[PDB]
Amino acid sequence: LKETIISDIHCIITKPDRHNLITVVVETNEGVTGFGCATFQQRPLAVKTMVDEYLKPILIGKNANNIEDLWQMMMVNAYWRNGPVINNAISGVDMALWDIKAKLAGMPLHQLFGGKSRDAIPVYTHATSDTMEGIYDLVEGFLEKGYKHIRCQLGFYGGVPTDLHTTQNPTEGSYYDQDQYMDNTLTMFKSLREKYGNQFHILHDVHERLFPNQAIQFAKEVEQYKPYFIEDILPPNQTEWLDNIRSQSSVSLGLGELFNNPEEWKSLIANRRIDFIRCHVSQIGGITPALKLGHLCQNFGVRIAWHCAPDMTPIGAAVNTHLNVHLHNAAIQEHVEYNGNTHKVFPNAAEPINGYLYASEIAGIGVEIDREAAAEFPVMYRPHEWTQSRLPDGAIHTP
Amino acid sequence: ETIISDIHCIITKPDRHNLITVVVETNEGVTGFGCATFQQRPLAVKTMVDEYLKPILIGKNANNIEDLWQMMMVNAYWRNGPVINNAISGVDMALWDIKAKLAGMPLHQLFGGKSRDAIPVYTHATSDTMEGIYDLVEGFLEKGYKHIRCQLGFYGGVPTDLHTTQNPTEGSYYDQDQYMDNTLTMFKSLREKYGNQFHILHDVHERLFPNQAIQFAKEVEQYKPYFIEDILPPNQTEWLDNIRSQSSVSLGLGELFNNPEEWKSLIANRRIDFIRCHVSQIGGITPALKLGHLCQNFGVRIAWHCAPDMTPIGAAVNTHLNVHLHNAAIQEHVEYNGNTHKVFPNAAEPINGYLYASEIAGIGVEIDREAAAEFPVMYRPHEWTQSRLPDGAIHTP
Ligand SMILES: O=C(O)[C@@H](O)[C@H](O)[C@H](O)CO
Ligand SMILES: O=C(O)[C@@H](O)[C@H](O)[C@H](O)CO
Ligand SMILES: [Mg+2]
Ligand SMILES: [Mg+2]
Numbered sequence: 001l002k003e004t005i006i007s008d009i010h011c012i013i014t015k016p017d018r019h020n021l022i023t024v025v026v027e028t029n030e031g032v033t034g035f036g037c038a039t040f041q042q043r044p045l046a047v048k049t050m051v052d053e054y055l056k057p058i059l060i061g062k063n064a065n066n067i068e069d070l071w072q073m074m075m076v077n078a079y080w081r082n083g084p085v086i087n088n089a090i091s092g093v094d095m096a097l098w099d100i101k102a103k104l105a106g107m108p109l110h111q112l113f114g115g116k117s118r119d120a121i122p123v124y125t126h127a128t129s130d131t132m133e134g135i136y137d138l139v140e141g142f143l144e145k146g147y148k149h150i151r152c153q154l155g156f157y158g159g160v161p162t163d164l165h166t167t168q169n170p171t172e173g174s175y176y177d178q179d180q181y182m183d184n185t186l187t188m189f190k191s192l193r194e195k196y197g198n199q200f201h202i203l204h205d206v207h208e209r210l211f212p213n214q215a216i217q218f219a220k221e222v223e224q225y226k227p228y229f230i231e232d233i234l235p236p237n238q239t240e241w242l243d244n245i246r247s248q249s250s251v252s253l254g255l256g257e258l259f260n261n262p263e264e265w266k267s268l269i270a271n272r273r274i275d276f277i278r279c280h281v282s283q284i285g286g287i288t289p290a291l292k293l294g295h296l297c298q299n300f301g302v303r304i305a306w307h308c309a310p311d312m313t314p315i316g317a318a319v320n321t322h323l324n325v326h327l328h329n330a331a332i333q334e335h336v337e338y339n340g341n342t343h344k345v346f347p348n349a350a351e352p353i354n355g356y357l358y359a360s361e362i363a364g365i366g367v368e369i370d371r372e373a374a375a376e377f378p379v380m381y382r383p384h385e386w387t388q389s390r391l392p393d394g395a396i397h398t399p
Numbered sequence: 400e401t402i403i404s405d406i407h408c409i410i411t412k413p414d415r416h417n418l419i420t421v422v423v424e425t426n427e428g429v430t431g432f433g434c435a436t437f438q439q440r441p442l443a444v445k446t447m448v449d450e451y452l453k454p455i456l457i458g459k460n461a462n463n464i465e466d467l468w469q470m471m472m473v474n475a476y477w478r479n480g481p482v483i484n485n486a487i488s489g490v491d492m493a494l495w496d497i498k499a500k501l502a503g504m505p506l507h508q509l510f511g512g513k514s515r516d517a518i519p520v521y522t523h524a525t526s527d528t529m530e531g532i533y534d535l536v537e538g539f540l541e542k543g544y545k546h547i548r549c550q551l552g553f554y555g556g557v558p559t560d561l562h563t564t565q566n567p568t569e570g571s572y573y574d575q576d577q578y579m580d581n582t583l584t585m586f587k588s589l590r591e592k593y594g595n596q597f598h599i600l601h602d603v604h605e606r607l608f609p610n611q612a613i614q615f616a617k618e619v620e621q622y623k624p625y626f627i628e629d630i631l632p633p634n635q636t637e638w639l640d641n642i643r644s645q646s647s648v649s650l651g652l653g654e655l656f657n658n659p660e661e662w663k664s665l666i667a668n669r670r671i672d673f674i675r676c677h678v679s680q681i682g683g684i685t686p687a688l689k690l691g692h693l694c695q696n697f698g699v700r701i702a703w704h705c706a707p708d709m710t711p712i713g714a715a716v717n718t719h720l721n722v723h724l725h726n727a728a729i730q731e732h733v734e735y736n737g738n739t740h741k742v743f744p745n746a747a748e749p750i751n752g753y754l755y756a757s758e759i760a761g762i763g764v765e766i767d768r769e770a771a772a773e774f775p776v777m778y779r780p781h782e783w784t785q786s787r788l789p790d791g792a793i794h795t796p
Contacts, residue, residue, distance in 0.1 A: 042475040043447065043477075045450050045451075046443055046450070046451070046482060049442050049443045050440065054442075057780065069792075069793065073785055076784060076793065076795055077439075077784050078481070078781075078784065079655075079781070079784050080481035080655065080657065083481050083483065083484075083657060084475070084477040084478070084479075084483065085480060085482040086440075086480065086481070087480075237659055237660065258477060258478070260477065261479065261657075261661065263633070263634065263661045264658065264660045383454065384476070387475065387476050388455075388470055389473075395469075396470050396473065398473055399473055
């Protein structure tokens with residue numbers, strides 16, 4: 001191996017399905033090209049500005065081989081640090097550098113790490129509908145495909161305030177009622193267990209919809225249905241309340257897709273407050289920190305379920321599968337089938353087979369972006385009205 | 400209702416620093432100004448304001464600052480961090496400016512008025528020699544300052560003078576042991592010469608590993624610093640327990656904070672004496688009031704970070720916060736140069752070691768948009784942030 005000099009950096013935003021996806025491309029003098037995921041779907045222009053105007057100038061000319069040095073350097077380069085815009089931009093670079101390294105090594109990404117500790121990673125997918133029969137329809141399709149884990153949600157939560165006990169002139173927003181949401185969810189679980197028994201593991205995402213007193217009540221009530229995990233039962237700033245849950249419920253908990261600061265997860269993990277870490281890999285700054293966090297979780301007996309919803313490139317998905325077949329404490333990979341457009345922008349994107357995702361076996365990450373093809377689906381402004389989530393009295397709640 | 404009619408985000412560089420101002424316009428003729436300054440990444444903040452905050456603010460009622468703050472903070476789902484928070488801060492401060500203007504009151508009067516007459520100020524004396532420090536100190540004492548942050552030596556640049564490797568990686572190098580030794584010599588020398596004539600502050604600037612920090616804290620204690628600042632990086636503050644158990648040294652920390660999880664345990668466990676957050680990096684006035692109150696409960700005082708790379712609008716806001724919040728302690732000095740005074744008129748300067756809050760309606764300082772246009776954004780690399788130890792490793796800068 002000789003020095004590998006960075007020659008150019010690109011940042012591409014594309015929207016082949018419903019979400020703005022962000023890819024970073026790192027070119028080298030040596031003609032070895034790396035690809036990485038930088039997807040912060042809600043603010044893609046801010047991530048692209050970050051890469052183009054700020055990371056590019058500090059990276060051109062540097063030796064790509066020293067990923068660790070470059071990561072440490074990038075993370076503190078703006079002085080102020082740790083956030084979703086900065087970390088996503090860095091992730092795109094970090095993943096691309098790992099891609100370049102694996103290509104130079106002539107190895108699949110996970111082989112650099114130390115290779116496999118499992119044959120493939122199990123997958124769970126999403127069944128959400130306003131009717132139980134909609135859920136049943138989705139569930140039965142997934143079971144036919146060999147899925148053994150399904151995240152189920154009954155009802156949609158966020159609409160006009162008129163349906164609720166609201167005030168005389170409600171502030172504009174996406175309204176919901178926490179009690180209605182909990183009641184529907186418990187009914188859903190009961191119905192699913194009566195209908196399917198233990199045919200599949202049921203997951204559910206509380207999505208920080210609750211106050212702490214509601215969260216603990218919900219944990220106790222849902223316990224009997226033995227969810228594989230209940231996800232984001234609290235927002236990231238009230239996880240200290242997990243202690244009271246852990247002292248009286250055996251419910252399995254996943255949390256962390258929101259994290260972009262180590263102080264959000266350090267005490268959480270050291271105190272065993274969760275069972276599955278859920279971080280979005282690009283939010284914490286890429287592969288480099290994901291390995292370390294995986295190892296931290298291993299020490300404390302916490303398993304890994306990285307956030308892998310559709311708001312991420314198939315490049316990012318492939319990276320997570322490499323991480324997932326390598327880290328011994330990886331548990332499961334979230335997945336939603338890719339549409340035709342996405343498959344076209346990112347060739348060779350793996351889909352699950354009989355409920356398992358297999359890591360790519362060519363050199364590198366295994367998935368790149370077709371640039372000229374990404375341009376057909378340009379960045380789209382989206383209001384994301386659901387993030388203006390309000391309770392009946394009109395107050396914002398964490399969405 | 401005060402309906403928001405437009406939002407602007409102006410980057411201007413009258414001095415060394417790309418400063419960022421948010422302007423909120425209204426149909427009530429009233430105009431608000433706020434600071435969104437993240438100097439190292441200004442275009443990212445501007446993108447955030449222009450493309451993302453503006454559409455969720457136009458047509459909304461500016462009176463309800465608290466709602467708008469809560470709404471903005473979670474609007475991108477992912478949250479916290481310097482880019483989003485600074486954008487939000489610019490808006491938040493401008494909404495406060497509008498409210499104060501409509502009330503016909505200085506900002507601090509909205510909050511509940513003064514709990515001190517003015518806020519003391521600390522200045523900066525950095526030199527390569529003790530004599531250089533003495534000269535600076537004496538000039539400050541003559542002007543009525545009683546608190547001075549002192550630093551002996553400059554720490555960065557070429558590693559030729561250090562015990563480095565054969566072919567050092569490009570970067571701004573320093574040696575932690577030389578830095579600690581120089582700082583201790585500085586404290587000793589200042590106390591020998593001036594005794595208790597003035598309070599001495601020093602900013603460790605996260606230069607140390609935890610084991611070094613603990614040792615330094617114990618050694619420097621005898622010199623009674625007013626505070627030692629950023630003795631640890633924001634991800635190693637658990638190590639403050641080690642220090643707090645065996646040293647009486649006064650500690651300030653937090654200019655780097657942008658996430659409440661960074662300060663919550665720290666404050667509830669009394670691990671610092673002065674909170675140092677930069678108001679715009681935590682999201683503006685709205686969260687600064689709450690954080691100030693949180694500290695008050697726990698017996699922690701306030702020394703918000705102030706620097707030339709914050710608009711004078713931001714400075715004025717801090718002085719309003721400082722004369723109002725009972726647990727405020729001291730305001731870091733920012734000697735603004737002439738161009739900056741031109742672009743941001745009526746900026747207060749210390750008088751006999753004190754900063755007095757503005758007494759006109761509003762924040763009291765605005766941006767002159769024509770003046771600002773004379774100094775467009777200019778790229779800067781900030782090479783100092785690539786800080787390295789003699790073996791070539793990055794250290795938090
Ligand atoms: O676990 C999940 O897939 C969800 O929490 C989504 O990521 C969230 O609605 C933002 O897209
Ligand atoms: O406390 C201070 O004024 C310094 O730590 C500055 O924030 C830092 O050098 C970046 O400009
Ligand atoms: Mg989720
Ligand atoms: Mg400082």
